[PDB]
Design a protein around this ligand. Structure first.
Ligand SMILES: [K+]
Ligand SMILES: [K+]
Ligand SMILES: [K+]
Ligand SMILES: [K+]
Ligand SMILES: [K+]
Ligand SMILES: [K+]
Ligand SMILES: [K+]
Ligand SMILES: [K+]
Ligand SMILES: [K+]
Ligand SMILES: [K+]
Ligand SMILES: [K+]
Ligand SMILES: [K+]
Ligand SMILES: [K+]
Ligand SMILES: [K+]
Ligand SMILES: [K+]
Ligand SMILES: [K+]
Ligand SMILES: [K+]
Ligand SMILES: [K+]
Ligand SMILES: [K+]
Ligand SMILES: [K+]
Ligand SMILES: [K+]
Ligand SMILES: [K+]
Ligand SMILES: [K+]
Ligand SMILES: [K+]
Ligand SMILES: [K+]
Ligand SMILES: [K+]
Ligand SMILES: [Mg+2]
Ligand SMILES: [Mg+2]
Ligand SMILES: [Mg+2]
Ligand SMILES: [Mg+2]
Ligand SMILES: [Mg+2]
Ligand SMILES: [Mg+2]
Ligand SMILES: [Mg+2]
Ligand SMILES: [Mg+2]
Ligand SMILES: [Mg+2]
Ligand SMILES: [Mg+2]
Ligand SMILES: [Mg+2]
Ligand SMILES: [Mg+2]
Ligand SMILES: [Mg+2]
Ligand SMILES: [Mg+2]
Ligand SMILES: [Mg+2]
Ligand SMILES: [Mg+2]
Ligand SMILES: [Mg+2]
Ligand SMILES: [Mg+2]
Ligand SMILES: [Mg+2]
Ligand SMILES: [Mg+2]
Ligand SMILES: [Mg+2]
Ligand SMILES: [Mg+2]
Ligand SMILES: [Mg+2]
Ligand SMILES: [Mg+2]
Ligand SMILES: [Mg+2]
Ligand SMILES: [Mg+2]
Ligand SMILES: [Mg+2]
Ligand SMILES: [Mg+2]
Ligand SMILES: [Mg+2]
Ligand SMILES: [Mg+2]
Ligand SMILES: [Mg+2]
Ligand SMILES: [Mg+2]
Ligand SMILES: [Mg+2]
Ligand SMILES: [Mg+2]
Ligand SMILES: [Zn+2]
Lengths: 122, 125, 53, 206, 114
RNA sequence: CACCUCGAUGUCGGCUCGUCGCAUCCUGGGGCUGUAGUCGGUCCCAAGGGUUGGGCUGUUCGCCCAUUAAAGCGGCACGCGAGCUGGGUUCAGAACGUCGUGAGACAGUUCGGUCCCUAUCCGUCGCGGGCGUUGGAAAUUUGAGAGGAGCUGUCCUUAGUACGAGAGGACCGGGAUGGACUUACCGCUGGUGUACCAGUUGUUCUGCCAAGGGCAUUGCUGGGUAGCUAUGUAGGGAAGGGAUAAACGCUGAAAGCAUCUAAGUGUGAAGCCCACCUCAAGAUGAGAUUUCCCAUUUCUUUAAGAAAGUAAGACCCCUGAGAGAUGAUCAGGUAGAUAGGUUGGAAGUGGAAGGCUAGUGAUAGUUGGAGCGGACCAAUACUAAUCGGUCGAGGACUUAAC
RNA sequence: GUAGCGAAAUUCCUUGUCGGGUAAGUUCCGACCCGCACGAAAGGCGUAACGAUUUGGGCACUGUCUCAACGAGAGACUCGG
RNA sequence: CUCGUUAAGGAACUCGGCAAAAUGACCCCGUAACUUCGGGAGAAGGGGUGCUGACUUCGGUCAGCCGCAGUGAAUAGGCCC
RNA sequence: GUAUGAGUAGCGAAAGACAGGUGAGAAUCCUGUCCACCGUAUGACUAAGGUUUCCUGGGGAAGGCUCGUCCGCCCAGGGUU
RNA sequence: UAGUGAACCAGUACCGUGAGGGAAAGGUGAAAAGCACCCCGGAAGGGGAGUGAAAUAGAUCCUGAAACCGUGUGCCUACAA
């Protein structure tokens, strides 16, 4: 459950390290975002030499959350942290490498490139 | 569920232990409606421990029953003092060895003058 | 808030309509025949369900 | 199609393909058609149905006489079903859970659990006032309206008794039917506490 | 409750091994990326067992790529081909929630070889 | 302007709660277009629903950030302070600029500065009692009327088709999945869970060891049943009728023509009446059906008379919860599983005590998934629902028919 | 009207302009100086230490909030006084 | 009203982080700009703490043991620009 | 003087339980047992102040925010070397 | 409720540190003949029996108004603004 002002780690190498949520896209009054949702965020801490830089407004997709996802088979998955990946408008990740595991929910959301780059999918 | 009897948790536990031990000692006491309807379960569970009779049940009961003098007799020119716990496991357990629960009865009596609190008599069958 | 207007005798009596006592559960005792509350020990003879207590 | 049952409780079931779905277990001892109402005798068409056999000591001579037509024991619950084919029913006829097949879409009616006296926040999902910043307005029902009417408009929702209302859930699914046990498994949850009366009917929307 | 037990007795599985929280288990979980079906092995310590009957569930925790992950499975789900008890650990409580805060060496569990 | 209020009508903004108007912000229908298509512009009909989260500022407003289908405009004492706040206006303190010879003051700023009231009446939200509904009762019911709900995105397909030189790119139709809202419920994920389990500190008590109790926020700490719960789960605003708004007609004269209208006849909107959900015969117009009881006794007066036993039935009283402020509702009262206990389980906790074994010891292993186990489940009349009492009909008249 | 300071507890115009901070800053910080209407003992400027002083930012922290849920006690509620 | 707990988020609340939360004892390491050279300073930021043996220069050290957690409860600064 | 509000607000920080006794009458007085509270005090002395409130035996009109068989209250005796 | 504040143990009770301020409160019956005795009750208070011309003159005592409270019932009242 990611909402405005919520801070997430960046699970790629685009340059941003920690981002802050500005909006939860997809609804007028939408409050919370979970895995596979796209958010507008700000880079509150960036790698010194990265492409994306501090204070830049960017879109990202939540790739794992502390409150995770419920699968149709009755199972659940939960991660130890909230991490997102900065993406272009076409869902292609801004960075080139993904760090840490990623949830399988991104496949049906059609983040195929992110899923392929992920070192592990659960 | 259980009644709060208008007390905090610790105070309610202390009052229940007192009244349960009093009923063990006397075998007949007068209290209010709610107090009797709670003391019945507690005292019957104590008697269940007494029926079991083993050391483990004795210690469990000791956690609850107070350390009072159930009675005193004079035997062999010696004063023998029997505690509430000793009376339980020596007299009440053997007494009810046959009954399957329902060791106590509650008789409704007239309301108390000071409060009109419904009074009852609780005793062993 | 305070009573804007005093309450008249008629309205006062109307409100107290339901402010009355009741007596219920009285019936003859088996042992002595005096009136007793049902499910209670007959205070006079101290008998209940045909036995002294 | 309709039947009366008892809300046994809630559990879950694995369907084909291994999906896990929550189900409500509703038991329906075969109901008995106690009376048939027609346009001629009553002005409308419906069938009265009884359920949950009742001990004789708990019934009245009028109640026993009423069920005497159906030639069965006294019933605890009696309800009328409309929008059915009177030709297919007659006094004394039985209705069993096998009326519904798995995958049928039904409407389930019950009596919501009673919450007793409840404040506006819980009862109507209203917003609280701030809990700090000097606020002395936490769980109150808001303003009562404008000055001009010199009154409070009706439907100004306030605290009061909550629950215990007749509620219908539409378009539930009959996950399974066990005729031997007189049980219907309905996907989801339905109003009412365990052992309460439940009314299953074929979904009107369909 | 007895009626519910009878209804769900059929779907209760039987090949469930004897494991308790604190033991390392490998779960052969079935997944579908479409028509094709595949088995993914989720190996980790059992952090939690709760519920009863058909409703019983268990949670398995593993640290993958420096991020902790927990998967909760129904105990009688057919989507899990097999549960395999890799090791028996020694724990003193039913719920190992404290493991979430621990990292690496701190989170190690002593084996017992039941 | 000075008509009510100065023996007091609290004054901005915000919060809680909304309600209403349409001069309509989105969604719906349509005309015109300098409407190719996608977009639009303007106008007409339309108030059913919806119409945001932040940075700054006491702010309204406004600017900005990011979204949205849209981020409407207004009334209700610039709605709402016996509902809240008190940041500002504005008391007394103090200071700056300024004015004054001065006390002081604003043609201005800045820091700090007591928000009282137990609801009588109406009104509003819930719940009972009385009587009525024309013999007395137990159930099931129709619906006069009333309330609730009413929103909408994106994607796929039709189809890169129609249109277009290309760029670009549909109408109509058919699917999938969301946002917000909302009705329920605890099987799942979690929360809580002060008479559940365990660890542990200090001190004190049970004479001591061992084992426990008391107090320390429930001493603290880790879990957690029932119940109550959302962020959890399931469902809903689906389809379709009838009369219409603007608009478009068909036929058709007045007026040989023309003409949607005068007669006649039709299409047509998230709107109106239904449809869906809920309440509902105190609907004094008190409705309807099924079933039960039976025409008793005494005295007055022909009385729709009076009282007194009852019948069907209900209640008092008592055991209770799925109910509950109290009433009430519902489950029961030995024709008994209503509660308590007992017995057996379950959740839950996590390996009791007493032994044994190893170790110098802390402690570990074993006896043994043990012990304990509020509300959960199933049996069991062992305990208590005993014994009893109160109330409760005999059914008017007139006129059709039979 | 010198030095010094200056949109200041003083700047109405004013949210002055520029720079910093923020995704966005009428507040805040640095600078500029057309000082409406600073200025040298009704002291000017600066200043370590100090402040239940006023002001802005950051970490930590959280039911302050999204958005409320449960539990304990007292009153409320029923009965007697 | 007083009090305990709270999923995910963590000031988005609000005039204002008001209130609450958080820090808190001792021991060791370490500690900035600036400064009136005293301070700033308990800056900051870290580590240790229970129990049982062995040895000690008596403060430690080593070895082992247990728990989620050792100033295991109560009492004790939030910090920085 | 008596109403209304109204048999309503309130009954002034916290633990009591049972057995026995007394008595016309007992949750409230006495005895007993356990429990609980304070313990740099809620303990022991004292100055001021109060001025008989001290003790014994009676009483339950009024006072005691309930009750009271009881009292720092009322009645009668006595008490400060 | 007049008449001195004070017809009565009044400059008192009471209020205030003090100066000072400052009340309320008359009536049995001719005569106490002030209800022996009995009954209910622990008492209080009643019912008899007595005193008295009168006790609804019984010490809250001449008369005994109204507000206010209550009992009994001749009439009306649960579709009414
Ligand atoms: K005025
Ligand atoms: K409005
Ligand atoms: K148009
Ligand atoms: K509208
Ligand atoms: K703001
Ligand atoms: K106010
Ligand atoms: K007002
Ligand atoms: K009024
Ligand atoms: K201890
Ligand atoms: K103690
Ligand atoms: K009726
Ligand atoms: K300047
Ligand atoms: K100036
Ligand atoms: K300062
Ligand atoms: K200060
Ligand atoms: K809280
Ligand atoms: K918020
Ligand atoms: K502000
Ligand atoms: K510092
Ligand atoms: K440690
Ligand atoms: K400190
Ligand atoms: K008065
Ligand atoms: K009154
Ligand atoms: K005495
Ligand atoms: K007289
Ligand atoms: K009268
Ligand atoms: Mg305690
Ligand atoms: Mg809100
Ligand atoms: Mg009006
Ligand atoms: Mg004039
Ligand atoms: Mg006035
Ligand atoms: Mg219009
Ligand atoms: Mg900020
Ligand atoms: Mg206003
Ligand atoms: Mg007002
Ligand atoms: Mg001057
Ligand atoms: Mg201050
Ligand atoms: Mg649940
Ligand atoms: Mg459950
Ligand atoms: Mg010991
Ligand atoms: Mg103590
Ligand atoms: Mg500026
Ligand atoms: Mg000056
Ligand atoms: Mg000078
Ligand atoms: Mg100076
Ligand atoms: Mg939280
Ligand atoms: Mg803010
Ligand atoms: Mg805001
Ligand atoms: Mg604070
Ligand atoms: Mg500590
Ligand atoms: Mg009142
Ligand atoms: Mg008191
Ligand atoms: Mg102290
Ligand atoms: Mg004395
Ligand atoms: Mg005395
Ligand atoms: Mg008294
Ligand atoms: Mg007279
Ligand atoms: Mg007189
Ligand atoms: Mg009418
Ligand atoms: Mg009438
Ligand atoms: Zn008797």
């Amino acid at each position: 459950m990611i909402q405005q002002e919520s801070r997430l780690r960046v699970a790629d190498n685009s340059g941003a390290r920690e981002i802050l949520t500005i909006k939860v896209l997809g609804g007028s009054g939408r409050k919370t975002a979970n895995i596979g949702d796209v958010i507008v965020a700000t880079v509150k801490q960036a790698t010194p030499g990265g492409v994306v830089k501090k204070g830049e407004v960017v879109k990202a997709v939540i790739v794992r959350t502390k409150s995770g996802a419920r699968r149709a088979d009755g199972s659940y998955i939960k991660f130890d942290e909230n991490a997102a990946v900065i993406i272009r408008d076409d869902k292609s990740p801004r960075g080139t490498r993904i760090f840490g595991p990623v949830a399988r929910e991104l496949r049906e959301n059609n983040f195929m490139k992110i899923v392929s780059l992920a070192p592990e999918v659960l | 569920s259980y009644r709060k009897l208008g007390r905090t948790s610790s105070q309610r536990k202390a009052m229940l232990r007192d009244i349960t031990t009093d009923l063990i000692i006397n075998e007949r006491i007068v209290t209010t409606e709610a107090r009797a309807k709670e003391v019945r379960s507690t005292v019957e569970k104590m008697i269940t421990l007494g029926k079991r009779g083993d050391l483990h049940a004795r210690r469990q009961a000791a956690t609850f029953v107070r350390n009072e003098v159930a009675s005193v007799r004079e035997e062999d020119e010696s004063i023998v003092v029997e505690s509430a716990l000793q009376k339980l496991f020596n007299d009440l357990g053997p007494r009810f060895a046959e009954r399957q629960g329902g060791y106590t009865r509650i008789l409704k009596t007239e309301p108390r003058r000071g409060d009109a609190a419904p009074m009852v008599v609780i005793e062993f069958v | 808030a305070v009573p804007a207007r005093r309450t008249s005798k008629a309205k006062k009596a109307k409100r107290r309509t339901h402010y009355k006592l009741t007596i219920k559960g009285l019936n003859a005792c088996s042992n002595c025949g005096e009136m007793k509350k049902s499910h209670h020990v007959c205070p006079a003879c101290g008998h209940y369900d045909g036995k002294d207590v | 199609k309709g039947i009366l049952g008892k809300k046994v409780g809630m559990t879950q079931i694995f369907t084909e393909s291994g999906e896990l779905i929550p189900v409500t277990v509703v038991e329906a001892t075969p109901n008995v058609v106690l009376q048939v109402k027609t346009v001629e005798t009553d002005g409308y068409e419906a069938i009265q149905v009884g359920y949950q056999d009742k001990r004789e000591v708990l019934s009245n001579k009028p109640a026993k006489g009423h069920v005497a037509k159906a030639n069965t024991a006294p019933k605890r619950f009696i309800k009328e079903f409309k929008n059915v084919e009177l030709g297919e029913y007659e006094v004394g006829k039985e209705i069993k859970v096998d009326v519904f097949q798995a995958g049928d879409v039904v409407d389930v009616t019950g009596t919501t659990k009673g919450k007793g006296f409840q404040g506006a926040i819980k009862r109507h999902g209203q917003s609280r006032g701030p809990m700090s910043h000097g606020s002395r307005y936490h769980r109150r029902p808001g303003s009562m309206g404008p000055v001009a009417p010199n009154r409070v408009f009706k439907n100004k929702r306030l605290a009061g008794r909550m629950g215990g209302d007749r509620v219908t859930i539409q378009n539930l699914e009959v996950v399974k039917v066990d005729v031997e046990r007189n049980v219907i498994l309905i996907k989801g949850n339905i109003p009412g506490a365990k052992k309460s009366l439940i009314t299953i009917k074929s979904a009107v929307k369909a | 409750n007895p009626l519910i037990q009878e209804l769900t007795q059929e779907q209760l599985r039987t090949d469930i091994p004897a494991f308790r929280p604190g033991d390392t288990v490998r779960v052969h979980a079935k997944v579908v990326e479409g028509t094709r079906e595949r088995i993914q092995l989720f190996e980790g310590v059992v952090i939690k067992r709760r519920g009863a009957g058909i409703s019983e569930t268990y949670t398995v925790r593993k640290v993958s790529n420096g991020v902790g992950v927990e998967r909760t499975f129904p105990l009688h789900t057919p989507r899990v081909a097999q549960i395999e008890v890799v090791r028996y650990g020694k724990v003193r409580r039913a719920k190992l929630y404290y493991l979430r805060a621990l990292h690496g060496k701190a989170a190690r569990i002593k084996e017992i070889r039941r």
